[PDB]
């Protein structure tokens, strides 16, 4: 729908809180920050020697936290390019995430270890509790306010811990209807409200109200607000997330390079965006405050946007853009 | 044969919101078009005036737009809904409307014939500001950056600095030519960083002052401008000028060629000229508050001039 020609070997991407900038982690170990206002590069960071597989913006928009494949986790100053701090873990890192209300805390999700929460100023840490003991593969997410941490393991068990104490305050196993378990591949929260979604190995996206889970308490059976799946092709989902307002959900099918978009409330498929057929889908993000979606496939970023009813059905004045490509400088 | 020429709008005036995600554009048909930098298309259209809108200003919080038409009507618009919040009828036309940069309950209106007026909108009191010598034909004015002072300038080159709340004269001076004649003050613009501002005068010289030096000087001072900027080759007069977002550059639109001149403020040096399509009349210019982007309106068409940082790579097959 319009790809970015200035960025190559894209691997992961995330918007800042206002969606003026797009941080793009790349296969060459660089973070390239693209600017929605100038439609050009804002900042390049030489961040690793190994591919950048995970990024997260601090709430104040000044810091980036990244993870390599060398098991390094670094915090960057987006203005200066400087590395404020750097941690090396045993085993590789799936996910890094700032505490949403406190950028001194970051959550790390290692491959074979339990999840770890750090504080950057005092280089202290917590390893978080774990249910099946042989969890090994566990993913975790702060909730929208950062007062709880949700985890999911390979056996379909969701722990709800309180971020300060790490105390189990709610839990439930996610059901295949049958009774067989199903692995949790990711947990994502809406930017507005209390809803979150779970991507699972049975290829059904489950939408839950966070409060519905707290009420159900320890070892509950909360029922999903919504169950999203593709019953034609039974497609697996590479990545899912909410719209910034939280009432739509996009999920990327790598298998058929397409993005499905449902309504969260009612549940019906609203539309499917098809990219080229050669390419493999790597990442998807939804703009925090606009009907814009970013896609990475085969190292190319694609922006999908939606303008309102007008744009010439309204006989508006003409807009022309004159762009002056200049060389990136620090 | 014709048809769509009848209803397509001409842009006449434009202004960025505080973060430069939105460009508000006023048109000949009274509409206000809100253009979105993030999606690169129109977000909203406000059906605002019966007549061309000529002045526009965004509130600090981004939710309200104040606008002036050729009806001598000053309206406040709620941008999310598109509803009018409040309307004023003036006698004589309006040159300029401006929100107080820190308190959007106050609006400065500059009528052509009259002296400038400051509205409080929670309750609609106005209060005329003082004017010297009563050449009150063509008084221009502007809040300074934080809105503690209003700066006025008249057709005889007299600049007053007034306290905003108390309205009391705290500094003044008179801008003269190299021949000790006065020249008319055509516009006043403050930068978004620092305390410098600029004036466009009828003698085709943009003067840059430090507002700190001017308060220091007090009533009937002689402060000298930090910079005097002008077309040395063609002596073009200036339709409109303003600072870059950080205050280090000044753009100035030629009233006689579709051309934008850009100087570095500190050393007064002219670094580039943007030539629009030949033959068009330049109507407005705005520098983006936080980016190297300039919007300009000429012959009803909006132009976005943007620098885009790229790397040198390109394809080989």
């Amino acid at each position: 729908d319009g790809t970015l020609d200035c960025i190559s070997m894209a691997l992961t991407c995330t918007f800042n809180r206002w969606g003026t900038l797009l941080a793009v982690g790349c296969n060459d170990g660089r973070i390239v920050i693209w600017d929605f206002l100038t439609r050009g590069i804002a900042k390049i960071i030489s961040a690793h020697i190994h591919p950048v597989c995970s990024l997260c913006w601090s709430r104040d928009g000044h810091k980036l936290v990244s993870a390599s494949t060398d098991n390094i986790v670094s915090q960057w100053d987006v203005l200066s390019g400087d590395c404020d701090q750097r941690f090396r873990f045993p085993s590789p890192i799936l996910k890094v995430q700032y505490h949403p209300r406190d950028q001194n805390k970051v959550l790390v999700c290692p491959m074979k270890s339990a999840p770890v929460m750090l504080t950057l100023s005092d280089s202290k840490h917590v390893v978080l509790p774990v249910d099946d003991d042989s969890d090994l593969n566990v993913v975790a997410s702060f909730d929208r306010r950062g007062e709880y941490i949700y985890t999911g393991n390979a056996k379909g068990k969701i722990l709800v811990l309180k971020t300060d104490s790490q105390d189990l305050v709610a839990s439930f196993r996610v059901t295949t209807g049958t009774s067989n378990t199903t692995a949790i591949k990711s947990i994502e929260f809406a930017r507005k409200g209390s809803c979150f979604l779970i991507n699972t190995a049975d290829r059904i996206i489950r939408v839950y109200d966070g409060r519905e889970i707290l009420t159900c308490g320890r070892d509950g059976e909360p029922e999903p607000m919504q169950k999203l799946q593709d019953l034609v092709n039974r497609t697996p989902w590479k990545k899912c997330c909410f719209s910034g307002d939280g009432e739509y959900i996009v999920a990327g099918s790598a298998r058929q390079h397409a993005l499905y978009i449902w309504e969260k409330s009612i549940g019906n498929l609203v539309k499917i965006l098809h990219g080229t057929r050669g390419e493999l889908l790597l990442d998807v993000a939804w703009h925090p405050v606009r009907p814009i979606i970013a896609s990475i496939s085969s190292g190319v970023v694609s922006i999908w946007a939606q303008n309102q009813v007008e744009n010439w059905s309204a006989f508006a004045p003409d807009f022309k853009e004159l762009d002056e490509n200049v060389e990136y400088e620090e | 044969a014709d048809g769509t020429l009848d209803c397509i709008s001409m842009a006449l005036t434009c202004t960025f919101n505080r973060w430069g995600t939105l460009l508000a554009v006023g048109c000949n048909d009274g509409r206000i078009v809100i253009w979105d930098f993030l999606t690169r298309g129109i977000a909203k259209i406000i059906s605002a005036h019966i007549h061309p809108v000529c002045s526009l200003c965004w509130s600090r919080d981004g939710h309200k737009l104040v606008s002036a038409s050729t009806d001598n009507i000053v309206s406040q618009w709620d941008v999310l809904s598109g509803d009018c919040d409040q309307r004023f009828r003036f006698p004589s036309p309006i040159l300029k409307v401006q929100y107080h940069p820190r308190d959007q309950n106050k609006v400065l209106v500059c009528p052509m014939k009259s002296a400038p007026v400051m509205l409080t909108l929670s309750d609609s009191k106005h209060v005329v500001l003082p004017v010297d010598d009563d050449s009150d034909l063509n008084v221009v004015a502007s809040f300074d950056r934080r809105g503690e002072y209003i700066y006025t300038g008249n057709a005889k080159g007299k600049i007053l600095v007034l306290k905003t709340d108390s309205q009391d004269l705290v500094a003044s001076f008179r801008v003269t030519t190299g021949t000790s004649n006065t020249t008319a003050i055509k516009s006043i613009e403050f930068a978004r960083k620092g305390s410098c501002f600029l004036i466009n005068t009828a003698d085709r010289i943009i003067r840059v002052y430090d507002g700190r030096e001017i308060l220091t000087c007090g009533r009937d001072g002689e402060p000298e401008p930090m910079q005097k900027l002008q077309d040395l080759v063609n002596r073009t007069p200036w339709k409109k000028c303003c600072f870059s977002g950080d205050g280090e550059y000044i753009v100035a639109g030629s009233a006689r060629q579709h051309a934008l001149y850009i100087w570095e403020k500190s050393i007064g040096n002219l670094v580039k000229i943007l030539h629009g399509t030949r033959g068009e009349l330049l109507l407005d210019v705005a520098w983006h508050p936080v980016r190297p982007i300039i919007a300009s309106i000429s012959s009803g068409v909006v132009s976005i001039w943007a620098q885009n940082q790229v790397e040198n790579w390109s394809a080989f097959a």
């Binding site: 004159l322 | 580039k272 943007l274």
Partner: peptide
């Protein structure tokens, strides 16, 4: 001191 045009 450049110039750009169009």
């Amino acid at each position: 001191e450049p110039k750009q045009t169009g």
